[PDB]
Design goal:
- The structure is cut from a larger assembly and holds eight protein chains of eight kinds.
- Chain A has 43 residues and is mainly alpha-helical.
- Chain A is elongated, with a radius of gyration of 18 Å.
- Chain A starts with a helix and ends with a helix.
- Chain E has a five-stranded mixed sheet with strand order 1-3-2-4-5, sandwiched between helices.
- In chain E, strand 4 and strand 5 form a beta hairpin.
- Chain E is globular and about 55 Å long.
- Chain E starts with 8 loop residues before the first helix and ends in a 5-residue tail after the last helix.
- With 92 residues, chain F is of the alpha+beta class.
- Chain F contains four helices and two strands; from the N terminus they run H-E-E-H-H-H.
- In chain F, strand 1 and strand 2 form a beta hairpin.
- Classes of the chains: A mainly alpha (43), B mainly alpha (101), C mainly alpha (97), D little secondary structure (11), E alpha/beta (188), F alpha+beta (92), G mainly alpha (37), H mainly alpha (313).
- Chains in contact: A-B, A-C, A-E, A-H, B-C, B-E, B-F, B-G, B-H, C-E, C-H, D-H, E-F, E-H, F-H, G-H.
- Chains E and F meet through helix 1 and helix 4 of E and strand 1 and strand 2 of F.
- Bound molecules: cardiolipin (CDL) (2 copies), 1,2-diacyl-SN-glycero-3-phosphocholine (2 copies) and dodecyl-beta-D-maltoside.
- It is classed as membrane protein.
- Keywords: ATP synthase, membrane region, lipids.
């Protein structure tokens, strides 16, 4: 197959998939709070 | 100095590998399942891409719905039909009487 | 050519609503996670709660005569001291006790 | 403003 | 401030010039119209199709480009699929560099691309491999599934339930602003 | 000399402009029928010309690299001239 | 008032030209001159 | 619309267009007085690539190699699979480079410009090699195989196990071509090609640098990612594939077309020659070929760039 060589490298752990489901480094509630603060200050 | 900085780089790359694994997992678990089909995509293309394609038009803040109205300035002989002329002749002035009433 | 035979204006409404909802989902998916969740769930929810509470329940401004009668709010967080003039929302069945 | 280095968040 | 220079003689030149052909020895290698499709070379033809034939019976368009090898691999099986299902749908073969406005219309971003169309917005399904994992067989299977789906939906509900959507009022002007001329709107 | 004929030709065609520095198309309206409009050019889903104008050569470079790999899979002694000349990074 | 001024200028600048039978952007629609060759 | 006598005038039209562009720019562009650029944590493709020129280069080279295509089809947002593969390859390369640095740079005691110079020098080198080979019709000659020595003749004959034919041209072509059997006229995988090249170089005693070796290996890997048909179609040759994938707006288009025309019309009439009849010829071919190789160093100073000149000196 064309992409099997690359897709073989994509093997995750149980903790890895749990962390992805939770969205640790991609939700960024600190970023959300910063946005809220800036938006309220912009009034 | 040397050893500590090189170990700093190595741990940076360990963190990078961890981030990449969780990124792959997040994608292939949640986003590949929640990805929109594309039927309800945005019905437009950005003006920059249009400009690169040579497709952008800028003008006509207004429009002319009917071809009868589009081809007036090109007909040169009958911009308005006879019936349309007779109808237009009734609005040569504004009706202050109707305004007042 | 407006309308088609065999189709109903209600079916047209349903199709239009489906289109709108699909477009909304697409636009929410292709958006920043930093702003969309907040602006779409947390501000609306708080505004809804506040407006509903204000327009439905009935509140009272409570004062206390002396400082020795003030409650002890040292343990509970976000309020370490009593302040007179406090707005308190209650239910219609509430008693003085 | 453009640069040759990419931050962690924009990686 | 953002600008892009208008164009160059190179860009405006013929994108599909002829190249030399080898003698009958290089062709000897280890790995060694069509009466069922229509090769499109004119946006006039493409619009005629999309606006009349796509409303009569569905169409399947293969957008390709010469530089692509996946397109050469997918051509023949696409011709077989056409010979198979030419009774239920029409089949068109488009080159993006020869007819770009047709590629802008179908919203194709990668080549090769299958596009199943009916009503021009009632059922537009695009099949492609943006990652590089699928193959010609998988693409053709997806195309068969999409054609089955569109035929079933067309038969469903006394021919209705497949009505154009946003194209009813957009006219693909946000995609390609040149449709204002087609619609007759001014440009001053 | 006659062997470097092709080097001379390449040096001749050196700085000719390409489509990677400008838009890929242009519209022309039929004066007799303004409702008719043609698009002269190519296809493009690309708008980063102000960056690609400096790397325009990479496409053909990588094509040449693939072709060199194909030739070397059969005969690897075709690069020996440059190795001996010292152009490539090598550790004798 | 804007419309009034526009028409008031159109009068002076068009009604006595002999060269503007219509607008130049639509001269393609005019018949062809039998005197030119 | 303005109350002017002629709103459809070219002055008005151009003024409206310029105002349109200025408004759209003032609204969308990233500036010191931004209107829409605000609350930015996840950037779109255009702004991302404009701010991070390093990623545009990497994401672009990966696109051209993973999918042999033109920059005009560059995707708006790349797939996470591609991004992950890029990160893995970066980890590999930087691990190798960091080990080498640890072991050399410390025992001893602007990346954009460096990358630009490296790429320019490399493309110049490959163009010069291609020209040198086209000088004798050895650039892209498949299923044929060029030979300039008896050692190479034996090496390439071991492919088909002595079978096949050998063709020649008279005293103007300085090499002899070999045609294997139709069943063995295939093309080999890029990983195998790189392995063969490196093995030959290390047997001759001229190994590349480790960084360049890893570069070749990653290139071969991203090429393998294409699958079965990575360079050619079933009934296609390498020259046809090159002319197919060749950018039409490339200045060298006519040069390559001329070369391939001449090569076709020559190979069409090329004569056949047996095995022993070439070796004695391969001797003088090797002689004049090493002479031409010695002359090549000076020839680079004739028209080559300052980089090639200084690296030859
Ligand atoms: C009970 C059911 C519910 C209630 C419904 C009641 C009945 C209404 C039913 C619906 C309408 C009728 C339906 C049947 C019609 C059948 C006949 C027919 O087909 O043709 C019509 C019939 C014949 O039509 P026709 O054959 O084409 O020939 C027409 C004539 O040639 C004449 O053509 P013309 O070009 O010469 O036009 C004449 C025009 C002349 O042109 C003008 O209008 C110039 C003057 C404009 C004044 C400024 C306009 C401000 C507009 C504000 C509107 C909202 C105000 C809030 C409402 C309450 C106001 C107290 O005079 C007018 O008629 C317009 C009068 C506007 C109202 C005046 C408001 C006061 C202005 C105050 C200004 C002074 C301020 C300082 C005050 C201090 C003083 C000391 O004539 C009409 O009835 C005309 C319709 C009038 C409608 C108003 C004009 C449009 C203005 C739009 C304003 C925005 C409204 C937004 C709408 C809501 C949002 C969607
Ligand atoms: C409890 C938790 C709550 C949290 C939220 C949970 C989720 C709930 C649903 C979300 C509710 C919020 C809605 C936000 C939408 C607008 C803001 C936004 O961010 O949109 C961005 C979002 C993404 O847009 P984009 O990415 O920037 O560009 C893509 C285009 O939008 C793509 O455009 P397109 O090509 O697909 O189509 C063009 C589009 C155009 O949309 C736009 O681009 C802008 C739309 C303008 C918005 C503001 C217009 C205000 C106009 C003033 C009204 C004056 C009327 C005067 C009447 C006088 C006559 C007497 O057409 C429309 O959708 C607009 C139609 C409605 C406009 C009505 C204006 C009057 C014209 C009447 C026309 C005839 C009626 C329609 C008949 C249709 C056939 C049945 O917009 C959309 O997805 C479509 C536009 C929104 C359409 C409305 C969707 C339904 C909303 C239901 C609201 C009901 C809420 C109450 C719930 C019950 C509570 C108790
Ligand atoms: C009530 C106060 C209103 C005053 C302010 C509003 C302005 C007053 C004028 C009326 C407003 C509505 C105008 C609708 C015009 C659209 C007509 C149309 O054909 O659209 C295309 C749709 C889709 O048609 P179609 O796609 O199914 O088939 C036809 C296909 N073409 C067009 C290609 C031929 O047609 C309809 O089915 C009729 C829709 C209008 C009826 C609904 C009114 C919309 C307003 C309510 C919004 C909420 C919807 C949910 C309601 C749920 C009810 C329980
Ligand atoms: C008389 C009254 C006249 C006045 C008119 C009154 C009616 C009309 C008033 C409209 C004006 C106000 C409109 C403001 C809208 C702003 C809201 C907004 O866009 O959101 C911010 C976000 C911000 O996105 P962003 O952050 O990526 O970019 C925003 C702009 N920049 C780039 C500058 C930062 O917008 C969206 O992306 C989504 C908008 C569409 C969704 C709207 C909410 C409904 C969502 C329902 C779907 C839920 C799916 C859940 C699935 C979960 C799993 C994935
Ligand atoms: C999807 C359709 C949604 C449409 C909107 C429907 C309304 C949704 C919100 C309903 C809230 C129901 O929850 C209920 O609200 C009312 C009003 O605050 C509260 O009730 C309160 O006001 C009423 C009026 O005096 C009394 O019951 C009492 O004084 C007090 O308890 C209930 O304690 C609470 O349980």
């Amino acid at each position: 197959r064309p992409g099997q060589g690359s897709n073989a490298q994509f093997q995750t752990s149980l903790a890895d998939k749990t962390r992805g489901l939770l969205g640790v480094g991609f939700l960024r509630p600190t970023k959300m709070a910063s946005f809220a603060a800036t938006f309220l200050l912009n009034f | 100095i040397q050893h500590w900085n090189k170990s700093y780089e190595k741990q940076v790359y360990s963190e990078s590998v961890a981030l990449n694994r969780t990124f792959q997992a997040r994608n292939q678990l949640v986003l590949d399942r929640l990805k929109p089909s594309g039927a309800y995509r945005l019905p437009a293309v950005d003006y920059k891409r249009q400009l690169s394609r040579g497709t952008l038009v800028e003008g006509a803040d207004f429009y002319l719905p009917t071809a009868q109205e589009q081809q007036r300035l090109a007909r040169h002989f009958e911009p308005y039909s006879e019936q349309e002329q007779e109808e237009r002749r009734k609005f040569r002035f504004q009706s202050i009487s109707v305004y007042l009433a | 050519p407006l309308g088609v035979k065999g189709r109903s204006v209600f079916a047209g409404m349903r199709s239009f609503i489906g289109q709108r909802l699909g477009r909304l989902y697409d636009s929410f998916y292709y958006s920043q996670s930093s702003t969309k969740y907040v602006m779409v769930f947390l501000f609306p929810a708080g505004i809804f709660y506040t407006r509903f509470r204000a327009d439905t329940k009935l509140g009272y401004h409570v004062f206390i005569n002396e400082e020795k009668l003030y409650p002890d709010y040292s343990q509970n967080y976000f309020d370490t001291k009593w302040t007179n003039g406090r707005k308190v929302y209650l239910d219609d069945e509430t008693t003085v006790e | 403003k453009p640069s040759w280095h990419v931050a962690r968040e924009h990686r | 401030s953002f600008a892009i220079p208008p164009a160059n003689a190179a860009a405006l030149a013929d994108p599909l010039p002829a190249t030399p052909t080898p003698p009958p020895v290089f062709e000897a290698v280890s790995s060694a119209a069509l009466k069922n499709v229509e090769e499109v070379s004119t946006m006039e033809r493409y619009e005629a199709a999309v606006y009349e034939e796509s409303f009569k019976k569905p169409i399947v368009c293969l957008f390709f480009a010469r530089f692509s090898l996946q397109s050469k691999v997918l051509l023949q099986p696409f011709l077989d699929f056409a010979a198979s299902a030419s009774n239920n749908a029409t089949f068109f073969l488009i080159d993006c560099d020869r007819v770009p406005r047709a590629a802008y219309h179908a919203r194709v971003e990668n080549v090769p691309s299958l596009v199943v169309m009916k009503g021009d917005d009632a059922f537009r399904q695009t099949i492609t491999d943006s990652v590089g994992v699928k193959t010609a067989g998988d693409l053709i299977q997806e195309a068969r599934s999409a054609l089955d789906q569109v035929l079933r939906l067309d038969q469903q509900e006394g021919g209705t339930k497949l009505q154009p959507g946003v194209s009813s009022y957009t006219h693909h002007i946000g995609v390609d602003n040149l449709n204002v001329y087609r619609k007759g709107w001014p440009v001053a | 000399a006659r062997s470097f004929r092709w080097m001379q030709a390449f040096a001749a065609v050196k700085g000719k402009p390409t489509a990677g520095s400008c838009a890929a198309g242009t519209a022309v309206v039929n004066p007799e029928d303004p409702t008719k409009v043609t698009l002269k050019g190519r296809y493009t889903n690309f708008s980063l010309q102000h960056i690609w104008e400096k790397y325009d050569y990479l496409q053909t470079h990588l094509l040449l690299r693939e072709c060199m790999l194909s030739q070397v899979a059969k005969n690897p002694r075709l690069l020996d001239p440059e190795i001996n000349a010292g152009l490539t990074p090598t550790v004798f | 008032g804007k419309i009034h001024g526009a028409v008031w200028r159109m009068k002076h600048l068009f009604a006595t030209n002999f060269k503007m039978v219509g607008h130049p952007r639509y001269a393609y629609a005019l018949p062809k001159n039998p005197l030119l060759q | 619309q303005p109350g002017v006598v002629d709103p459809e005038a070219p002055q008005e039209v151009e003024a409206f267009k310029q105002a349109w562009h200025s408004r759209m720019g003032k609204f969308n562009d990233r500036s010191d007085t931004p209107m829409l650029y605000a609350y930015m944590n996840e950037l779109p493709s255009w702004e991302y690539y404009d701010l991070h020129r390093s990623a545009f280069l990497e994401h672009m080279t990966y696109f051209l190699v993973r999918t042999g295509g033109d920059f005009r089809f560059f995707p708006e947002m790349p797939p996470w699979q591609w991004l992950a593969h890029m990160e893995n390859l970066r980890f590999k390369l930087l691990s190798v480079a960091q080990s080498r640095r640890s072991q050399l740079q410390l025992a001893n005691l602007h990346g954009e410009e460096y990358t630009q110079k490296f790429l320019q020098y490399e493309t110049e080198l490959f163009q010069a090699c291609a020209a040198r080979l086209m000088g004798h019709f050895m650039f892209l000659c498949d299923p044929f195989i060029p030979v300039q020595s008896a050692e190479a003749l034996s090496a390439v004959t071991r492919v088909d196990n002595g079978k096949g034919k050998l063709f020649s041209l008279g005293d103007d072509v300085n090499a002899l071509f070999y045609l294997p059997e139709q069943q063995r006229r295939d093309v080999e995988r890029p990983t195998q090609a790189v392995q063969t090249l490196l093995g030959h170089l290390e047997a001759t005693g001229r190994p590349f640098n480790p960084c360049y070796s890893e570069l070749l290996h990653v290139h071969a890997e991203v090429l393998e990612e294409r699958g079965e048909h990575w360079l050619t179609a079933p009934g296609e040759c390498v020259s046809q594939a090159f002319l197919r994938r060749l950018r039409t707006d490339d200045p060298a288009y006519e040069v390559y077309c001329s070369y391939f025309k001449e090569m076709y019309e020559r190979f069409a009439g090329a004569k056949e020659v047996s095995m022993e009849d070439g070796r004695k010829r391969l001797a003088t071919i090797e002689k004049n070929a090493q002479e031409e190789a010695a002359a090549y160093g000076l020839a680079l100073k004739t028209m080559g760039s300052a980089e090639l000149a200084h690296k030859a000196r």
